Ligand binder design. Structure first.
Ligand SMILES: [Mg+2]
Lengths: 585, 37, 76
DNA sequence: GTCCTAGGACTGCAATTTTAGAGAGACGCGA
DNA sequence: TCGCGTCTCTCTAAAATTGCAGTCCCGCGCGCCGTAGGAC
RNA sequence: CCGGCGCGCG
């Protein structure tokens, strides 16, 4: 056997600004959402028709926001451990101060020559750098070479990431790790940082990801039909970015960065920024994560069509493979099949006429519904599905009322009782689903529980009491006779049950039954109480529950079983069930 | 608590499916009760 | 070749190490080690006549060492 | 009246917050 | 004329708390209340 | 056809 190979994959990856532009190409420039008067999409706004599409494509077409200054991605700076800090090999405090405070970084780039002895992150502004150097070097040329020795904000971070030599990083980390090893709490943590840094730098070499994509130059904009809260955060980015380009000052640069962080991930900077109602905003991370997020609520579980619900009532006359469906639920679930049945036999001119006929509850609609429900299974399901037997397949039949009729023997698997429980019904539409439901999910091939293998559809409660009373034998000993004793004989079980029907004997009155089969009565392994041996050869062996007549002359052997009508009835019920099933096939 | 426990229990082994007739292993756990065997 | 092998197995003649090696000779140059590894997994946990030989191991190793991206030293 | 209008509970874990261990440059006293 | 514990920091190895991050059954039904603020 | 609050059923 050669396996039917299927090679399908999906891969996430950090995106590039060029790919963001390719997504948009289409830039959102104005923070206006909708017209206050005409209720029309404002041009170049968050809902622009030119950018996103005419008012299907509005669910998929993306836009972008051209940020004047680069802003770091909050996931890769503020989340612990910081990826940017590890790759740049600097403490998180100094990086956060460079991004959030008025700090300037000395020597941000290396692949271009410099002429200054400025190293580290000088918190205070350099007094000479304020006037002396710019006034001697004028303005145009100074600004031309400005962003090569001193810079600040996320731009410095992006410059540091862009010119990083990953192979040099790996080699330096390895040599430092060896030095540390050749020499005890953070003597190990520094090693663990070193191991984490080379593994982080190694992954960038083999992939197409660039470490500078960790700082955003463009901001993709969600399609409008997916945001008919998120819109408010998008306006702020445009609100503070468009202010920044008007200036072209450091404070507004930080405001744009905070707007993006709040849009991307709130509740990560300690105090999460709230709205005017003192309520925390919801970011993309919030809507994709959590139990109520996209992954665990929209993708792992879905609401479906062709489904119904009603209260469960017991039907003891149902078969093990059948269920009762309310007429309204059935006509709703099988509506398309009823329409096809109406049109097929020329009783409906078109689909609209058939739907109108169904809406009027015509008496011929129910004939077609009954016809099309034959052979089409349904799936029942109780609410707390704890194992796979919590959903099973049955053959629906039309029952009067508004309740779902359920077999009593399948309640244990559903963990259902008839005190207010409800169930959902589903209709398999395609032929493959119908075959799956018929051949895998019906109750008659699911008699055993998968946990350990015990039967699941075993009689319980009322049936158990009935069987116990039926098979509870005779009163014996002092409970049968007032005094120390110092019963009818039936040819066959039918005679005994007939006598019981005519009230000649009780359910637990003792009787002797002629046995014409082998000895197959479960009884204690005991010798006869009494053997009555006759001088003619015949002897009678009297046991606790049967009498056996034997002879030395012949090979005859007669057996009489002392029992009640209840034991006979149980045995006949099982025997007749087997014989009837055999004959019917 | 059981609902949280069940979700973590199913999650850790959700990918386990009978995919081969015989892996070809020779190792065998040694046993020296009836319902287990 | 894959279509003919599928048809041959449908006709009642199961694939052996020879046919699997023939198939692997082309998968090893596709640049995706997972195809060759899927074929190798099919061979390794199958019947006696499908078991890998030196040529099969060579094909899978060549597929892994000449991969387009990611590291494969652990796999090799 | 209003029309635009801008504070559990448990676990995990890196991050301080020391505690400590050694330790040395300049030294006031001293041999 | 230097030599001696040593004054005054001094810089980092090694635990010791400590402040977040993460999570904490499933499936149904019904009702109410939002959408605010200010110079006219 | 959007979310919060309250009350319930299994
Ligand atoms: Mg109940």
């Amino acid at each position: 056997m050669i396996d039917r190979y299927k090679h399908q994959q999906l891969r996430i990856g950090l995106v590039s600004p060029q790919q963001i532009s390719a997504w948009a190409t289409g830039e959102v420039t104005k923070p206006y959402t909708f017209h206050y008067k005409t209720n029309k999409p404002e041009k170049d706004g968050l809902f622009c028709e030119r950018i996103f599409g005419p008012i299907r494509i509005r669910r998929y077409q993306m836009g972008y926001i051209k940020l004047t200054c680069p802003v770091t991605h909050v996931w890769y700076l503020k989340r612990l451990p910081s990826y940017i800090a590890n790759l740049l090999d600097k403490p998180l405090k100094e990086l956060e101060g460079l991004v959030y405070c008025d700090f300037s970084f000395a020597r941000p780039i290396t692949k271009k020559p410099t002429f200054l002895r400025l190293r580290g992150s000088f918190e205070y502004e350099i007094q000479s750098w304020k006037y002396s150097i710019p006034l001697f070097f004028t303005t145009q040329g100074f600004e031309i070479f400005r962003n090569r020795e001193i810079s600040t904000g996320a731009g410095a971070i992006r410059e540091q990431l862009a010119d990083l030599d990953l192979r040099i990083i790996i080699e330096n980390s390895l040599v430092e790790w060896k030095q540390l090893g050749e020499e005890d709490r953070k003597i190990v943590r520094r090693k663990d940082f070193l191991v984490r840094r080379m593994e982080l730098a190694k992954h960038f070499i083999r992939t197409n990801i660039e470490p500078e994509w960790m700082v955003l130059c463009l901001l993709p904009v969600l399609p409008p039909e997916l945001r008919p809260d998120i819109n408010e955060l998008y306006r702020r980015v445009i609100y503070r970015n468009n202010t920044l380009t008007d200036l072209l000052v450091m404070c507004q640069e930080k405001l744009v960065q905070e707007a993006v962080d709040t849009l991307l991930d709130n509740g990560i900077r300690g105090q999460p920024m709230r709205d005017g109602h003192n309520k925390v905003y919801k970011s993309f991370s919030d809507v994709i994560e959590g139990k109520e997020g996209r992954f665990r609520e929209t993708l792992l579980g879905k609401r479906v069509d062709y489904s119904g619900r009603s209260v469960i009532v017991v039907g003891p006359s149902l078969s093990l493979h059948r269920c009762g469906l309310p007429r309204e639920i059935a006509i709703e679930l099988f509506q398309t099949f009823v329409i096809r049945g109406l049109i097929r036999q020329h009783l409906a001119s078109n689909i609209g006429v058939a739907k109108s006929q169904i809406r009027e509850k015509k008496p011929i609609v129910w004939e077609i519904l009954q016809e099309v429900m034959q052979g089409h299974p349904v799936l029942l399901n109780r609410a707390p599905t704890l194992h796979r037997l919590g959903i099973q397949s049955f053959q629906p039949i039309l029952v009067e009322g508004r309740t779902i009729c359920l077999h009593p023997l399948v309640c244990k698997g559903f963990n259902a009782d008839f005190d207010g429980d409800q169930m959902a019904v589903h209709v398999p539409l395609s032929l493959e689903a119908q075959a799956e439901a018929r051949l895998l999910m019906f109750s008659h091939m699911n008699l055993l529980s998968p946990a350990i293998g015990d039967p699941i559809s075993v009689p319980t409660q009322d049936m158990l009491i009935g069987l116990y009373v039926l098979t509870s034998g005779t009163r014996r000993g002092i409970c049968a006779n007032r005094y120390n004793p110092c019963e009818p004989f039936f040819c066959n079980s039918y005679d005994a049950i007939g006598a019981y029907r005519q009230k000649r004997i009780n359910l637990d009155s003792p009787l002797w039954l002629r046995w014409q089969l082998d000895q197959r009565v479960i009884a204690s392994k005991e010798v006869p109480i009494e053997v009555h041996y006759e001088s003619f050869g015949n002897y009678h062996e009297i046991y606790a529950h049967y009498l056996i007549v034997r002879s030395v002359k012949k090979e005859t052997l007669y057996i009489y079983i002392r029992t009640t009508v209840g034991h006979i009835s149980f045995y006949r019920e099982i025997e007749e069930a087997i014989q009837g099933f055999s004959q019917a096939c | 608590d059981a609902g949280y426990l069940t979700r973590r229990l199913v999650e850790v082994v959700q990918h386990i499916v009978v995919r081969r007739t015989d892996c070809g292993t020779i190792r065998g756990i040694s046993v020296s009760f009836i319902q287990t065997l | 070749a894959l279509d003919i092998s599928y048809e041959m197995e449908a006709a009642g003649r199961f694939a052996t190490t020879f046919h699997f090696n023939c198939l692997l000779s082309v998968q090893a140059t596709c640049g995706i080690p997972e195809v060759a590894y899927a074929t190798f997994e099919n061979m390794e946990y199958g019947e006696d006549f499908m078991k890998p030989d030196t040529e099969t191991y060579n094909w899978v190793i060549q597929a892994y060492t000449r991969a387009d991206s990611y590291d494969r030293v652990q796999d090799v």
